[PDB]
Design a protein around this ligand. Structure first.
Ligand code: K
Ligand code: K
Ligand code: K
Ligand code: K
Ligand code: K
Ligand code: K
Ligand code: K
Ligand code: K
Ligand code: K
Ligand code: MG
Ligand code: MG
Ligand code: MG
Ligand code: MG
Ligand code: MG
Ligand code: MG
Ligand code: MG
Ligand code: MG
Ligand code: MG
Ligand code: MG
Ligand code: MG
Ligand code: MG
Ligand code: MG
Ligand code: MG
Ligand code: MG
Ligand code: MG
Ligand code: MG
Ligand code: MG
Ligand code: MG
Ligand code: MG
Ligand code: MG
Ligand code: MG
Ligand code: MG
Ligand code: MG
Ligand code: MG
Ligand code: MG
Ligand code: MG
Ligand code: MG
Ligand code: MG
Ligand code: MG
Ligand code: MG
Ligand code: MG
Ligand code: MG
Ligand code: MG
Ligand code: MG
Ligand code: MG
Ligand code: MG
Ligand code: MG
Ligand code: MG
Ligand code: MG
Ligand code: MG
Ligand code: MG
Ligand code: MG
Ligand code: MG
Ligand code: MG
Ligand code: MG
Ligand code: MG
Ligand code: MG
Ligand code: MG
Ligand code: MG
Ligand code: MG
Ligand code: MG
Ligand code: MG
Ligand code: MG
Ligand code: MG
Ligand code: MG
Ligand code: MG
Ligand code: MG
Ligand code: MG
Ligand code: MG
Ligand code: MG
Ligand code: MG
Ligand code: MG
Ligand code: MG
Ligand code: MG
Lengths: 56, 114, 209, 123, 118, 14
RNA sequence: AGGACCGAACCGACUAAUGUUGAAAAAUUAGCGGAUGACUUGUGGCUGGGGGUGAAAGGCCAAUCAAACCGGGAGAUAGCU
RNA sequence: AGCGUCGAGUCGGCCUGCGCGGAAGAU
RNA sequence: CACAGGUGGUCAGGUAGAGAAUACCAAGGCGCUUGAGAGAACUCGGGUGAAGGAACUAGGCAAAAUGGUGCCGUAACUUC
RNA sequence: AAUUCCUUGUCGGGUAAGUUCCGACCUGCACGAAUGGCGUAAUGAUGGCCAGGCUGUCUCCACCCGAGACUCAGUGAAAUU
RNA sequence: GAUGUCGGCUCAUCACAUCCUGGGGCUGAAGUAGGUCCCAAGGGUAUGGCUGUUCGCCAUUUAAAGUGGUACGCGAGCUGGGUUUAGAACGUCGUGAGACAGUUCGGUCCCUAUCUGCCGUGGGCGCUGGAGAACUGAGGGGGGCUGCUCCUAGUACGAGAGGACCGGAGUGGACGCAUCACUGGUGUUCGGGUUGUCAUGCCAAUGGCACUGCCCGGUAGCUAAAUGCGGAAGAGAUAAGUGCUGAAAGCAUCUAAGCACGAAACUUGCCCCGAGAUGAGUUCUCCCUGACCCUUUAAGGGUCCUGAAGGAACGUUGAAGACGACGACGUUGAUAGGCCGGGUGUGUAAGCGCAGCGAUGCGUUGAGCUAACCGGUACUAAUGAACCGUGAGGCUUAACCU
């Protein structure tokens, strides 16, 4: 099945109105290092909740 | 859980004998035929045992009048009066459904002496 | 009249002296505490609001905590309402036990049925499946036709299709009251009631009995 | 659980040996017949000299089923075959004078007291 | 419907799942820390820790069961010589899962699963 | 079933 | 010995399902027939369009066949759209 | 008309204006 | 088309097997150029199924079922 | 009857019930003897009918195992208008 | 410059010229059973043999197996048996090519849904300070079927045969809603038997593959064939019909004034949704009681301070679920995994010893293993925080208090 009329840019935007992305609300700060990270995720340096869980 | 456990354990018989599949057992059941109430005996080989506590059951197969009859008794049902193990059998399965296609010398079960 | 709110514990069996096995459902009906009584003047109708169970203090919100404090009762897991018949009166803070069904013979049980999710037409509306063989092509559990060539040239409202099945309010009426154990706060009724184990049930006196 | 086209064995000395159910009597769109239900049958095999002949349309009552019957306590009594007793088409009474094999208590009715009495065992 | 059911299919059949989990358990025992997708680590928790519980008691039958379940004599020896005594006092929590972001080639949630005593 | 040119089935009224 | 039998390679294509903007402008999977013969196959050669070839279906003759393709007569003709 | 009695109208036919029934169908 | 297609010859290991069938392996080669999750309807490819057993359908379509070796034994008809 | 319109001709068999099938009758619309007639063992991925076994073909569907469908990240069409 | 046909399957929807059930008049209506007419559309309204068949005949059921419209409903839902391509044959027609309202054998059914429509599920804003709950009910949807037996009563009726009305119980068929207590199915995540082959050096014991290799059982969940429940009783207004009183018209008359009845039809009564019901409703509870400056000086803007109730986000997850959404938890913690104990299933593990030439048997031993189950346990993962959401909430008019 195919369209009988060409949809409009108005309808295209109305459909795409729900396609907007959502940014991260906030970033946690590690106590020991102080780096920003996602909550419940280890930092880039390898620290989680004040403990060096991994090396690098 | 605990509530249902108590409700079921307050209804379980404490005089149930220990039997295994392949054992010949006789079960006395209350006919309650008409006004009178009498006991009828059903003797046969146990082929299946379901041990679910109060919901426990056992299946007995008997060749009666040339016809095979399988009867499933609820262990703790008041209609069952007495279970007596007439003979012990030696099998290696919990279920003996292969006996449904055997008759005569092929349906014999070796006795468990020890 | 009014009913009670309990929790579904499970199903079991009761053996009677004549050998009959009755499949019963265990319903844990503890004390229901009255939190608010409504009248024809302030509210326009007569009903009582009740609560049951317990709830965590750290999760009871401040408005709910204030409502329960005004009621004078401890916080429960929810709030329900029961219409008051003529000549029936209750006070705020009153505790109602499972003894209310001591003389009740038949009850109606309302619950939330187990959710089946998105279900097809065959499961949801008992539609007949088409032929599995004899040339059938990719149309086995499909609904089939849903209208007419023209007049109306559309699909009627209420057409039986696929969609959400279960997870809805279901009432089963006229269930025999097998037992009322006041000591254990238990109500044993014959048959099955909607919902799974741990769901909240509402048990009322039968209306059609 | 006997439907149309189901083959049954006779449990009486009426002359038949194998019958086929052609109609489950007792209502509209009725599907199955259990123990104690009247059915319309046709005769497929018969002994050379008997009361009934092959190709006769009669009525019968099922006395034994593989599905079995259920007792109030939840017990089930299952047999190894489906058996029926031939009945007269009008009076609905047994044709033979003997019943072979055990029967169940579901036939304990004023209509089938003759079958109950003639049966060897009633389990 | 999957009411009251446990086990992740992980877009694999039973034999592939069993082989993959056996290899991953061997790797985790060998290295004491491995990086993998989060569902894989959560499913690994349910097959590695019972192996340490079995290795807590040393016997020929237990060793043969561990060999039947792992197919690596080095892994069996390590479980019954080091991880066993190390976790003898501990009960239950022999593993830890640390979420470490997302993979580059695909947006797969990754995590580190290690041993608590490491 | 006959297939006409342009891969369309010959299902015309006759 | 057999245009003998069962059955692989090999050669075909009887049924069903999938696909039918396909993995494929004719295929895949499960079955199916012949399988020492009127068999199958590699390389090279010959037959040319009102002609060839055809154990014959108007079948095939470069994904095109009740008259192939290319160029020309040619801007054929069209009381038709 | 009602059951000799009775005590003011009564019985129909015609031509006419407007009304009633006959008159049940499918989104 | 980095396309489930087509394309002639040569070599021919072990175990089981009549076998170049088939199942598992050796030498050798490969995991097929998007992945990660979840475990709705529905579609595709399969496994199992109480009682009945073709009642389905234009039609036993499709499935299900039989299946090897040795021995015993085997009908009408026949151009033997 | 691969031939028969009337026609589901009539009788018999098979089935509880058979416009199909088989065996007969001959009233052959409109068979017929090398555009051959009538039989015929074996053969046939040939047409029609029946029986045993078998079964999800069905009564009447149920559950399970995988590939899509669904969500996330990357690349990124089509008919039609 | 294309509207796909006959029949079959799935799914239906409307009309009443009503097949059954329901209510009545007449009857050449003794009763049972009938005939005809009127009202009534709530529900229900067969399975097979033959045939491509609709139809039809036949067999056996049922209370009944209704009549029609909907592109002779329904092929962007399926089929392709019939009728309509190309092959071939028979009868017949023609000299022939070929052709029969003639028979017979065989013969490709595409489409990823843009809009309306429908089935489910979300985001935004509004409802005039914000927030958490519980409700009311304008409206809408679902359901409404019926057999048989017994009592009344072998009574009424009837010469007999036969055989009731009204009323009251029980048990069934079909349909629908729930649920897994029982009986079963499934249960490629549990246990075991066994064939071929390869590997762990070898014996033993195991693992890979061969459809889960082939099987035998089987937990939880799901589920029917399993078992609980339902159709109502009652009320109001009526249809056909039946009446009371009563004149017009001294009589008569159900009607013109009045009054009483009267059906599965209508409105309620039973179940579910439901305040986007913009007419946006009601009740309970909780939270915010700073300062200054400009102005185009009013439902204005700006700065500093402040950030409450609550929500969102993240993590562990669910008998909730396509994704959202919904539910339970986040250390003051049983949310998930693991661990302990039990239960269930399977069936007497491995090692060792003994008997036997050996296959093998016996003892340790109802042993070992055991998924989703049950009761516990903080061992592991659920981090302190941060984010959104404000600072008493317009005008007019009435009524009270002040
Ligand atoms: K072949
Ligand atoms: K030419
Ligand atoms: K002819
Ligand atoms: K000849
Ligand atoms: K052939
Ligand atoms: K109606
Ligand atoms: K269309
Ligand atoms: K189960
Ligand atoms: K042992
Ligand atoms: Mg979008
Ligand atoms: Mg659910
Ligand atoms: Mg069907
Ligand atoms: Mg196709
Ligand atoms: Mg299909
Ligand atoms: Mg259409
Ligand atoms: Mg779980
Ligand atoms: Mg995937
Ligand atoms: Mg495998
Ligand atoms: Mg040959
Ligand atoms: Mg072909
Ligand atoms: Mg092939
Ligand atoms: Mg051959
Ligand atoms: Mg061959
Ligand atoms: Mg031709
Ligand atoms: Mg060509
Ligand atoms: Mg020409
Ligand atoms: Mg010219
Ligand atoms: Mg031109
Ligand atoms: Mg008129
Ligand atoms: Mg490639
Ligand atoms: Mg290729
Ligand atoms: Mg080749
Ligand atoms: Mg090979
Ligand atoms: Mg799946
Ligand atoms: Mg499938
Ligand atoms: Mg199968
Ligand atoms: Mg079956
Ligand atoms: Mg079976
Ligand atoms: Mg059979
Ligand atoms: Mg048929
Ligand atoms: Mg049929
Ligand atoms: Mg076939
Ligand atoms: Mg097969
Ligand atoms: Mg005939
Ligand atoms: Mg001729
Ligand atoms: Mg000839
Ligand atoms: Mg994407
Ligand atoms: Mg056009
Ligand atoms: Mg009418
Ligand atoms: Mg009504
Ligand atoms: Mg018919
Ligand atoms: Mg037949
Ligand atoms: Mg039509
Ligand atoms: Mg119609
Ligand atoms: Mg059609
Ligand atoms: Mg055709
Ligand atoms: Mg032709
Ligand atoms: Mg199609
Ligand atoms: Mg539109
Ligand atoms: Mg309705
Ligand atoms: Mg169950
Ligand atoms: Mg259970
Ligand atoms: Mg296993
Ligand atoms: Mg060995
Ligand atoms: Mg291998
Ligand atoms: Mg291999
Ligand atoms: Mg099994
Ligand atoms: Mg089972
Ligand atoms: Mg009067
Ligand atoms: Mg009057
Ligand atoms: Mg109406
Ligand atoms: Mg826990
Ligand atoms: Mg073992
Ligand atoms: Mg055990």
């Amino acid at each position: 099945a195919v369209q009988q009329n060409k949809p409009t840019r108005s309808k295209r935007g109305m459909r795409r109105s729900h396609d907007a992305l959502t940014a991260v609300t906030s970033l946690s700060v590690d106590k020991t290092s102080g780096e920003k990270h996602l909550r419940h995720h280890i930092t880039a340096d390898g620290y989680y909740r004040g403990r060096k869980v991994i090396a690098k | 859980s605990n509530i249902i456990k108590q409700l079921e354990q307050e209804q379980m018989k404490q005089d149930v004998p220990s039997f295994r599949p392949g054992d010949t057992v006789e079960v006395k059941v209350w006919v309650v035929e008409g006004s009178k109430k009498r006991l009828q005996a059903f003797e046969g080989v146990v082929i299946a045992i379901r041990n679910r506590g109060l919901h426990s059951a056992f299946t007995v197969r008997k060749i009666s009048n040339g016809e095979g009859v399988e009867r499933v008794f609820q262990t703790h049902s008041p209609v069952v009066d007495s279970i007596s193990v007439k003979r012990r059998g030696a099998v290696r399965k919990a279920k003996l459904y292969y006996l449904r296609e055997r008759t005569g010398k092929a349906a014999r079960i070796k006795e468990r002496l020890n | 009249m009014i009913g009670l709110v309990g929790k579904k514990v499970g199903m079991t069996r009761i053996f009677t002296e004549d050998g009959v096995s009755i499949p019963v459902t265990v319903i844990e009906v503890e004390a229901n505490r009255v939190t608010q009584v409504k009248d024809l003047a302030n509210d326009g109708y007569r009903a009582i609001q009740v609560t049951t169970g317990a709830k965590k203090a750290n999760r009871v919100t401040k408005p709910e905590a204030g409502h329960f404090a005004k009621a004078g009762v401890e916080a429960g897991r929810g709030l329900w309402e029961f219409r008051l018949a003529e000549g029936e009166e209750f006070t705020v803070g009153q505790s109602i036990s499972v003894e209310l069904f001591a003389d009740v013979k038949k009850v109606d049980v309302t619950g939330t049925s187990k959710g089946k999710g998105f279900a097809g037409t065959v499961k949801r509306w008992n539609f007949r499946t088409q032929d599995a063989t004899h040339g059938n092509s990719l149309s086995h559990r499909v609904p089939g036709s849903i209208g007419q060539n023209q007049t109306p040239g559309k699909v009627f409202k209420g057409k039986k299709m696929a969609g959400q099945m279960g997870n809805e309010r279901v009432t089963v009426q006229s269930l025999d009251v097998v037992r009322v154990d006041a000591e254990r706060n238990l109500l044993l009724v014959k048959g099955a009631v909607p919902g799974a184990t741990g769901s909240d049930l509402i048990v009322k006196p039968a209306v059609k009995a | 659980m006997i439907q149309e086209q189901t083959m049954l064995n006779v449990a009486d000395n009426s002359g038949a040996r194998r019958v086929m159910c052609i109609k489950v009597l007792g209502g509209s769109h009725r599907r199955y017949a259990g123990v104690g239900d009247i059915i319309k049958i046709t005769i497929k095999e018969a002994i050379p000299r008997g009361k009934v002949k092959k190709g006769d349309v009669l009525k019968a009552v099922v006395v034994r089923t593989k599905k079995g019957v259920r007792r109030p306590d939840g017990s089930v009594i299952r047999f190894d075959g489906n058996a029926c007793v031939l009945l007269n088409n009008n009076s609905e009474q047994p044709i033979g004078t003997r019943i072979f094999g055990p029967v169940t208590r579901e036939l304990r009715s004023e209509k089938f007291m003759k079958i109950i009495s003639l049966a060897p065992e009633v389990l | 419907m999957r009411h009251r059911k446990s086990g992740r299919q992980l877009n694999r059949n039973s034999s592939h799942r069993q082989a993959m989990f056996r290899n991953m358990a061997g790797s985790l025992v060998r290295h004491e820390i491995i990086k993998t997708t989060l569902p894989k680590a959560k499913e690994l928790r349910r097959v590695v820790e019972p192996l340490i519980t079995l290795a807590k008691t040393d016997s020929v039958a237990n060793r043969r069961l561990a060999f039947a379940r792992t197919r690596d004599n080095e892994i069996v020896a390590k479980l019954f010589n080091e991880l066993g005594p190390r976790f003898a006092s501990r009960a239950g929590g022999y593993t830890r899962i640390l979420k470490c972001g997302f993979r580059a080639g695909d947006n797969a949630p990754m995590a580190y699963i290690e041993l608590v005593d490491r | 079933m006959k297939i006409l040119h342009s891969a369309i089935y010959a299902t015309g009224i006759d």
